[model samples]
Target chain A: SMPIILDSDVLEVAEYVYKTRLSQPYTEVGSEWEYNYKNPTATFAKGDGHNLQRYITIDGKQLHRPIAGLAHTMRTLMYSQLMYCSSKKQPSPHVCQDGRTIADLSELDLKKINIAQLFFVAGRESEASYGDAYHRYHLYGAKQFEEYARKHLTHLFSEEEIRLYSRCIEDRVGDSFDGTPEGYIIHLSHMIDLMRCKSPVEVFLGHSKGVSGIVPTLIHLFGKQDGLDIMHYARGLFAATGEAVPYIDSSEWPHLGVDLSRVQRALSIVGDINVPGQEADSKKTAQAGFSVDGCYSALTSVPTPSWYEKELK
Target chain B: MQIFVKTLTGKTITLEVEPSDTIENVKAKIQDKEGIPPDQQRLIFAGKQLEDGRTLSDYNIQKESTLHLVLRLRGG
Candidate 1:
């Protein structure tokens, strides 16, 4: 399995993982820079000792602060059959027949092993309900994830808390959805479904159209105002990802592909969260100097990020 | 040869110039009228580059036309 530390591939993986966690903010939090720092010892104790540990902290101290050292109590998970086999001292799962681990496993394996699954498709739903059949199964099915969360992680969230979280994010699901591949919304939902996972890393790959869809999903999932720090990093990723999409995958989907010029026009029309000369006056503009250019510039020395090499014509 | 020009975000003004003249020449006229030097000005025509020396044929500069050349100011 590819390690998360492989920075070059991390963004691509991050996009997939992000898709997996998009809609649900209660659990599948790949990033949480708001509440973690001031209360480092704070615990959202679930039934067992499995309190949702601080995965990524935003102090509310600095805007787009540089992250360092893992938050305490980190648990690593990979959707790898080989890792499963090694842990069990078995000859790997039958699915690892090709000698590749996570590569051979279906998306189900990732859901089963990663808590993100609960937030995404793993939580089965009944076919007759408003949700997808798979989602309904996860919601009301016998001895399922929601039941597990209720019984075990009561301190992490009461039934009321779950309902509120669901409500808060319900409007976020597709309102801001701009492009297809609805994967990032899936990413946020997966994160919210997470029962007790720590420091999670997820991955996905896409052609141009898929790549363009990430930011709207994230902004909607997090909500615009309360999620300032997340917006910072997300905007950074948006700029980088937008620039990289055409260079890497534009040719693959020539017709339905994204064009930066078009995006720029759209951006101009829809405009920035802050208006042109009115940023400081606009409450939405939290950090004036913060941008993808700023984020990429900050990370340049730490092994050239693949984004720097991939230039759009 | 000469034609009246209008700014998309501003007013209309007439200038006399040949159809064969490049966009740069019009931009120079605007720069003179707007009191800004050439180095400080860029002409945006139809949301694309209207760089100097690009002939009317290169872009869609037509006869007896009203062109909008946005005088954009750059920042660091």
Candidate 2:
């Protein structure tokens, strides 16, 4: 139970993210925000430079925007390796079950050092720490992003109705659920790892399945009053980055297939999102299996994505 | 021009290219063959980072020259 100290390499990456302030633009998306502020180069744009898209998508739907900073690639690469190592039951020096801590990479092969550094950003550790603070004060009960959520939610529900929804989120997966920002980042990194899978349709389905519980909870909580209320609340929390949660489409009211109830149901199941068809030996089930109602099982399970098998090629 | 591109996994891919091909073009080729996107690829030749806008010849890349391909994710 010591203070979670980060390794120097990890610390450097954490500091870099802090120095860059990659997530600050959502506060000003209307004015100063045009793109990822930290890495302004046009390279971050998706689908050749001509497309203005910065986010990766599947089945013609926008998945999530890449973090508008340099560290995303670093996180993605390292997380992938971590997943691969974990799957093989090999020890990973870059991350751990409690938190991501860098190893003394100084003594390693120079090529491996470069490999690790490619996944390094200076301030990610701090961002997660600050993210935890934000999750605690602003997201949960404290009301930091409440106004933003409110403006978006009023048309959908009454003020009291909005509070009820927020209460559910705060009660369910607030700051304490993940404990630290690093944990949340780890979650997101896991999402990215899934999204990068070989099959686009499979990856999308995987992402949708991972968050499937949200739809059921929405109906159970609001009594089928239209899930938009819950959707907006979730959107508001992630508004700072202009990215939706990895797999769910929080914009429309179940608009995929008429009631689209089937699509929603299929997409929202709590089974698999990472590394298609590798679920037989999945270690993800345990982490997600927590909670009285198992409401968070899908959202929390950390699976070793199947795409890592490509490295075997 | 035929050059050697080394991947982070220590695998090497040999490419037959035109001297006029841009580094971005090389990255595009790598993307198709390796799934690493152009933006996430950092190409270093002769210890100098190769820019996407420049041609391989601009960096004096010649036959058998070794270009290290470093794949990066979007951000941490």
Candidate 3:
């Protein structure tokens, strides 16, 4: 394998730029043909500004010829939400009633911009070099970004609980399971006891003929102690980024608050999010693929994120 | 009235002008001072762009007030 070596020493700061794109498909419902960051399958079109300067400006400062690196190499499944009845996709009376307004970005306290993140992955040519550059520049482990994940991870688990789920996915390969689809097993590690890892649990994907409704399956799983433990760990790893596809009714959990026992979450032992029924041009989006389906590859979905692929591997 | 043009390079040029002078007239003076052509110049005040057709008075110029001199660009 060919590798490009880099010298030690890089500029790393702990200031994380917080960001949120308007949930996908909704942004597309009333939008133009501009390049988007995440949803609607848009790729970067402006890394080089008019082909003369190798710099970008932020805060009136010139960042000349920046060196961006890639983090990992693996495949993933990309699932966009394509459905006839996604209630949140439009301003319906059932969801909200107004002409959806278009949006744009604002000045974030940089040294960073939201568009830069998309560009970072765009520069990847199948390698984990930048992944380590990240790890080497800032090696805080479970200790770094702990509070931000707790206070501002409003869409997912708090910081204290996130490690357990990331660890559980780590257990999949460690426990002698091959990387084949048939070898699927979900594990919840022993990393919890009034919040400490002492006992672990596992759930092998039950092989049924058709797709198992983890929508209903998780509701039942959450009703039981260990099954609830499965989701307890899974929720820590899962981001509610995509709306449930095949249109399930399992989205009743309050954002980061409430036991799975209180409500069902949208999970599929085997289902991917889809693009809207009549809108996305399959010929166009399929050719362009998704700009950010997964970090390693243009995946339809991911069990673990690109950070995990680089950070843990 | 004396109007000032601030360049991005941290230099500001003061081009004395009659309030009756058009924006094109002001840019022409800038060419003699800094050697930038009126064709390659855009006078931005308030970031909306200073059109060079109207007189400085009609464009609401006040004495010693500042407008930013912007350059057209391309990059490698």
User: Could you give the C-alpha RMSD of every candidate to the true structure, in order shown?
Assistant: 24.0, 22.9, 25.0
Interface DockQ of each model: 0.01, 0.01, 0.01
Residue by residue across B11-72, what tens digits does model 1's lDDT show?
Answer: 45777776667765776886676654543333433323344555665656556544543222
Can you tell me the DockQ of model 2? 0.01
lDDT for each residue of candidate 2 in A164-223, tens digit (9 for 90 to 100): 434423333423323322333333333443332223333322224444333343333233
Second chain TM-score, each model:
0.61, 0.89, 0.83
lDDT of each: 0.30, 0.38, 0.29
Rounded to one decimal, what is candidate 3's iRMSD? Answer: 25.3
Q: Give per-residue CA lDDT, model 1, range A1-313, as digits (tens).
A: 2221213223332233233321112232222211232343344311111112212122332221111010000011211211232223223322322234332433333333333222333222111112232233334322333454465546655676445333222323333321211222233433321211110000111123334233333233333332233323222322321111001112211122234454453343223433111011111111111332233332231232121121113
The best candidate by TM-score is 2
- Where is the poorest 10-residue window by lDDT in model 3 chain B? B67-76
Model 1 bad stretches (over 4 Å): A1-313, B73-76
lDDT string for model 3 (A213-256, tens) is 23234334223332343333333222222111111112312221
Q: TM-score of every model?
A: 0.23, 0.29, 0.24
Lowest lDDT sum, 10 consecutive residues, model 1 chain A, at A65-74
Q: How high is each candidate's interface RMSD, in Å?
A: 21.7, 16.0, 25.3
TM-score of model number 1, chain B: 0.61
